[model samples]
Each structure stands twice: as C-alpha cells, then as structure tokens.
Target chain A: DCPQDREELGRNTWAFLHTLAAYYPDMPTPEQQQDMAQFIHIFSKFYPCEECAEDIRKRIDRSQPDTSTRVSFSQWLCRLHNEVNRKLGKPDFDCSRVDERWRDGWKDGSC
Target chain B: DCPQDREELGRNTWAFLHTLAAYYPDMPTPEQQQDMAQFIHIFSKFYPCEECAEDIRKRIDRSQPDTSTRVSFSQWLCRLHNEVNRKLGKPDFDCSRVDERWRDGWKDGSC
Candidate 1:
C-alpha cells in the first residue's frame, strides 16, 4: 500500500490529463501553450509508476506535445493514450471522440 | 452533452488535482513548486464550471498552496477540498488520510 498500483494509477492519470485537455483554452495564448507544454514535460517526470513513467517520457521524446489549440492537443493526447493501449493489447480509442469524452459528456447522457 | 455537468466535472477535476498532488516531489525544487503554483492558477482558469471556477480562484487567492513538499502539498489540497465540501453540505475528509486516499492504498484494501 506504500506505492500507487498500476490500475488506479492509470485511471486517475487519464482522468486528470484528459480532463485538463477539455478545459484548455480553445485558442491558447503563446504563454498558455508554453506553460502547458512545460506542465506536461513536468508530468513526464511524475505518476510514480514503473515502465509507465519511462513510456510516457519515451513518447514525449518521440513527438512534441502540440499545445497550439485545445482541439489539436486533445487529439494528440488521445493518440498518445491509444499507443500505450495498443502496447497493452487494448483497443485504440478513436481520436474523434476526444472532446466528446472529456470536454463534453457523451450524447447518451452518461454524464 | 455540450458541457461537463457539475458532478462529472467535480469528480474528474478532483481525480486530476489530488492525483497530481500524490505524485508531487517529496522535496520540490523552487521551479517545481513555482510551476505547480502556476498550474493551479491556470486550472482556476479551467474546468469551465461556473461558480466552481470562481470558488477555486477565490480559495487560491485566500491562501498560498504549499508546494514545498509532497506531504505538505497533499494536506493543503485536502484541506482546500474540505472547504469546498463544507460549502456544498458534504462531509469534510480527514487530512490524516490524504496520502492513504491518494498516494497509497487505504488500509481497508480500497484503492
């Protein structure tokens, strides 16, 4: 119980990251985007998991986290999560539903 | 469905914010503390949830979020949340269990 386990870790993390995206400024200012990018890079050093930490760092190195706009950032984040999902044999999430899932609730009234 | 409902918004926002605190560095650097302080400030600009957003801002202005270390930060966050809970007629959480709820598993085997 001293360390955060993987399942809970992943769930809480995605909620935070994706939810953060939902409220991102639609057309973020230059400083806003820069801070977000740094905040993410800071997160890459976080989450206190095993290979999960390394994996996030690797993914960040593999591509720039685009913070130019909310829509762009959401799609980028979705794809990033999907890549990790695929590696774990989970189905890749559809990037098209990023906002619907995090920003706005599903049309089915799930929220 | 065009926006996150209050319940959904609060749950996801807490998940992110508390989880972020759980992983905060045990002894944060000046810059790390600064960024997290800024991050909270930015998040106040976020979540897009009406009075909730204003409330978070007011709380930040009222007190400095202690980011000197993880334990201090976690307790501060829990206390911060309890204030909101009081306003909403919810039970305040015990700060003693802050890490157990977020950083480590609860002794009762709940994650």
Candidate 2:
C-alpha cells in the first residue's frame, strides 16, 4: 500500500509538476532550484539507483514502436519537476546537483 | 528531464525496494527507520497529494479489467516504501507519521 502510494505520489507529483510548468512558467527562483535539488537528492534515498523512465518508455514503445509518439522521459520529468516545485511556491528549481547522476544516460537512451 | 528523473526515481525506488526486500531482509535500525519516515515525509513535498496508482491501475485495467489481478495501490506503495527505506539501510520504516494523510483511503479503496 505504501509502495503504491509512493509510486502514485511519484507519478502524481510529476504530473502536478508538469501542470504547474504549463500554467506558471514565470515562477521559481534561483534559490528555489537549489532547494529543489537538495530535496530530490534526499528523495532519491527512497528510490532505486536506476531510472524508471526507460522501463515505462519501453512499455509505451512496445505496443506502438512505429507510432512515432516519442515522449522523452527527460523532458517529461523536467516538466513535472518544474510543475511540482512551482506548486510548492518555490521560485526556481535548480535540480542541477542530482541531475548529473540521474541524467547521465540521457544521451545513451538508457534513462 | 528532472520530472522524468523523479518519476523514474519514484518507480525505481519502488523496484529497488522490492528487490531489497527479496534479497536483504535484516536491515535498518530503529533510528534509521525514523529517519526514513522523515525522509519520505520530506520527499512527498515534490509530489501530488492525489494518488497516481489509480491512474496506473485504470490504464492497466483498461486492457485487462476482467483479469482478477487486483494489485492494491496501498499495498504497492507500502511495499515500495519499505523497500526504499530498507535500501537506505533503515529498519522498520515507521511511516506512521505521514501514514494518516496518505493511507486514509485504503479502507474506502481510494488509495
């Protein structure tokens, strides 16, 4: 139940963040970004070392591999993170600190 | 991309937790457990309060609703939470602190 909650929370949080970004772009400050990165680093404590976007993308692509509905996990995550931070009323969401660790395989198509 | 990482982190964290539980049983300390609870409470800051398991289940059920593969969101989330906490080297994750706000819908089947 808690795991489900965590997953839902994780996904919903990303969704909320995506919505926030679309609704409020001119939000979040430089300081807020730093705070967000720190928060996420700590948040990573409860998650796995690998990323889940790959798995989700693979699932999405499995059915419609040639559909050309390419939805990059990185882009979605960025939007969601932004939205979530915005919802929290933060000025900016740096997230640069953990970005390297998590986003490392972005170019390689792993994450 | 940050949002994507968050989702991946969220899901992978669950996956990692699930794996940890299967592989490592005896872990985490009483204080580590408390720390994990606190960490999750803080982690929830970037996520949506509304559950995402419902959405995932709906999607999964859309194709196979007749299948009695009822995987409760609360159970998944609880298990994921435990896994993450366990991986973090914490034992007996006492999420009771934030359990009330999140797990209230389990009885009503909303979580």
Candidate 3:
C-alpha cells in the first residue's frame, strides 16, 4: 500500500476541500477548514488544484465497474473544464492579477 | 471564434460558476448568478464538468510560447483530483449514502 501516496492524497483532498471552503465561509468546521487551507498553502509545492475537481469526480464515478465502464465524476469534471476552455480559445484566467480580498471581485462587480 | 461553441462555453462556465456560488450565497448580483445557474442546469446535457478543469488549465499554461508551456489552473485541478483518488485506491465516495444535508457532515462532525 502506498502510505505516502495515501497521505499525499489525503493532504491534497483536504487542500482542495479547503479551496472549496474559500468560497464557502460557512462550510462545515472552522478548525478543520483552516487546517485544510493551511495544509494546501504549506504543501502547495507538493499538490496543486489546477484540475482536482474533475479528478475526484471521476474517481467516485468509476468506482463501480459493471455499473459504469467509462470514467467517473472527476473525469467528467476534467473533460468539461477542458472542452469549455478550448471552445473559448483558451483565455488566461489569472487570479494572481487580483488580490485575495477581491478574488471573486469580477464575478461580483460584473454581475 | 466558435459562436455556438463559445455560447456553450459561456453556458458551462456559468454553470460551474453557479455551482461555486451555491457555496458562496453572498456572491455577486443574485439575478445574474441565478441566470448562470439556470443556464448550467438547462445545458446539463451539453457540457460536462467531468474532466474539463485539467483541459482548461493545460490550454492556458501552454498558451504562451516563451514564458510558459505547461498546464494552467484548471488543468492542475484535474490532476490533483485524479492523483488523490488514485492514491486512495478508488474508494466509493457515494454522496447518496445520506443526502445533501450530509454533504459536508463528515467535515463538520468528525473535525
């Protein structure tokens, strides 16, 4: 068993979960949420959220072999995200341009 | 640009955006947000979020010739999600176990 891999995976899962929390201030638990967030920032060099949403979805979807032979929810997330970007001509969605306080600024200000 | 494709892209983008907004109830203008959400649900049969995140990231990262030639944010999201699931040995993460109420239950209760 890949203990390190499992740990890394747990770390990454928590990290991405925290990313979701970034948008959901009142998610579940404040302490766990913060722990996941810090873990993400600290081990950011190790795991990245560039395309994690899709991956997890796929993993869950593909759990059953006979029921479904194709990719799972995570896979679907990856595919959809990719196809849309390709259709739009791949524009740069740089969050670095704006600060944290205004991370969702465009979404808020525009509409 | 692919007009229909772009439209579809926009539709899906808003779809995912609203998904995020659900977690962020205080997000931007409520009307626009609802529009995006409805659009996504309506076009659910069209674009899928399974594997789109990674694809988008790759497109953005590889957009520039001199500066960078790698995957972008979306792409990274795909990868992390996938890798974490793989590490965990593809366990069944059935959300149907309980209901929407239990979505973040584990995160809140356990932690």
Candidate 4:
C-alpha cells in the first residue's frame, strides 16, 4: 500500500535532495564537483513530473549549479527548494537553518 | 521544521527514485538509457548514508540496471526496493502493483 500522490512525491523528492546536499563533502574534489553538476542536469531532464522538471530546468539554466563546495551547494539547493515553495504558495524556509533541517538534530533534539 | 532522520531520508529517496522510474519514457533513446545508468551509478556512490550507499552499489553491480523500457525500469526499481525492504524486515511489495503505487491511481482512487 505504498501509494503516493504527486504532491507527496514532490515533497519526498525535495527532502531527499536537500538531505543529500546537507551531507556532501565539505571540500569536494574536482571530480566530485563535476559529478554533482552532471547529476543536477540529468535530474532536471529526467524528473518524473513534467511541469516540475521544466521549472527545475529553467531554474538551473538561470542559476547554474554552484558546486564549488559543500556549503555553496547546500545553500544553492536550499534556495532552489525555496523557489518551489514560493511557487506552491508555501512558506519560505530560512536558508540559515538548512543544516538543522536536513543534517543535525534540532537544538531541542526533537528530531 | 524539515528534520529527517536517516530512515526517513531513505524512505523519501526510495519514493523519489521509484516515482521517477514510473514516469520514465516508455521508449527511451540510447542516450537516455545511458544517462539513466550513469545516474544510478553516481547515485549509489554519493548517497548520503554510507552504509546504504555501499549496499546500493553492490546491488547495482549485481543486478545491473535494466533500462530497455519504462516498464522494465519500473519493475527493476520495484524489485530493488523490495530487496531493501526485505533487509529492513519490512513487508515485500508485490511488483505487479508498481504502476498502481507509483504511476496510476489505485482502483479505489485512494491515491
């Protein structure tokens, strides 16, 4: 009974993408950086939802992927996700809290 | 407020990957197939959880991605996910229902 609607699918995808960014190596090698950039490009092309995929493509084209380092990539992804949130009329998340949201537990350890 | 533990991350990632397979082109070009294979390889290497990443790498090595068509890819992904579910002591999903779970709505229209 693993049913998922489109909105659920999008949320889960975003969660996974942001979490991956959170765990990226702090100082990635050139190869790692290139791989990540290629990943983003391919991801945009092949994402399941056509409309969302198109939006991602435009965003990538406009912003390019900032894969210079872990911090840059994470912040870039946070902003990217925020763009989607804004489009969906969801509240924009504070980029400064990316680590707490994706990687580390909250200060209260509720996570 | 987007805190995700490791297990949660895994669940979301699987959801995204399966949904992507569900919506893959029914008849993909050779280049599209090659891109998918490469995507899976890189995804295995760079998955955030080290243990899960290694396991995925081994699974991909053993199974090799079947990218011939959308149905094949979706079935392959369903089987792969069942492997993980089995390892985690979860119930096995019926591969026959992959489309209902990921792509088409269920007969009951609950999804």
What are the per-model DockQ values?
Answer: 0.34, 0.06, 0.02, 0.65
A7-65, model 1: which lDDT tens digit per residue?
Answer: 75577568767877877888999988987887777676654666553378767867879
Tens digits of per-residue lDDT, candidate 3, A1-111, equal 111223343433432332232223333254434343332232222222344433433433343211111122223323433443455476633423222322233434541
Q: Rank the candidates by TM-score, best first.
A: 4, 1, 2, 3
Evaluate residue B104 in candidate 3 and report its C-alpha lDDT on the 0 to 100 scale: 32
Considering only chain B, report the TM-score of model 3.
0.22
Clashing pairs in 4: none
Residue B35 lDDT (model 1)? 76
lDDT of 4 by residue, A1-111 (tens): 555676888889888888889888999999999899989988988886654533887778789889888889999998988887888788998989888878886768887
- Please provide, for model 2 over A4-110, each residue's C-alpha lDDT reduced to its tens digit, 9 standing for 90 to 100: 34445455444443432222223445544444444434334433324444333333333221111112223444544555456557565544433332334344455
Q: Is the docking of candidate 2 incorrect, acceptable, medium or high quality?
A: incorrect
Worst 10 residues of 4 chain A by lDDT: A48-57
- Model 1 / residue A73 / CA error / Å: 1.0
Candidate 1: deviation at residue A23, Å? 3.5
* Candidates 1 and 3 compared by DockQ, better number: 1
Of the candidates shown, which would achieve the greatest DockQ relative to the real structure?
4
Per-prediction fnat: 0.36, 0.05, 0.00, 0.68
Winning candidate number (TM-score): 4
Report the C-alpha lDDT of model 3 over B30-59, residue by residue, as the tens digit. Answer: 443344333323222222233444444444
Poorest lDDT segment (10 consecutive residues) of candidate 2 chain A: A64-73
Against the unseen true structure, what C-alpha lDDT does each candidate score?
0.77, 0.39, 0.32, 0.86
User: Which residue segments of model 1 deviate by more than 4 Å?
Assistant: A1-4, A104-111, B1-4, B107-111
- Tell me the tens digit of each residue's lDDT in model 2 across B60-107: 334321111112222344544565456558675454423333423334
> Least lDDT summed over 10 consecutive residues: which range in candidate 3 chain B?
B64-73
